Amino acid sequence: SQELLKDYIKRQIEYYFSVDNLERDFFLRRKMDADGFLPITLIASFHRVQALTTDISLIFAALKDSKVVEIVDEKVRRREEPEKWPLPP
Numbered sequence: 001s002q003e004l005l006k007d008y009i010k011r012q013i014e015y016y017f018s019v020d021n022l023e024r025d026f027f028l029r030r031k032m033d034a035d036g037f038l039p040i041t042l043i044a045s046f047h048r049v050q051a052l053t054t055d056i057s058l059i060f061a062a063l064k065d066s067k068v069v070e071i072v073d074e075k076v077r078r079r080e081e082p083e084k085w086p087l088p089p
């Protein structure tokens with residue numbers, strides 16, 4: 001139920017941080033800081049995520065113990081070599 005919704009949110013956000021998406025998603029990379037971090041609330045504003053939920057606790061929960069992304073406080077980044085992806089804003 002909410003477990004199912006969490007799975008869709010997880011797969012969607014993990015896609016944003018995939019190499020396949022990152023090679024072409026210049027908007028996302030222009031929003032990263034130098035360590036590759038993005039605000040989780042920015043991800044929450046993306047159309048395909050906001051359609052699924054506006055519950056920020058559910059969005060955080062979907063990403064807990066992800067093998068693709070790392071959460072530090074309010075920010076999220078790709079786990080593997082995040083620093084290679086940021087672009088000038």
Ligand code: NA
Pocket residue numbers: 041042045
């Ligand atoms: Na936003």
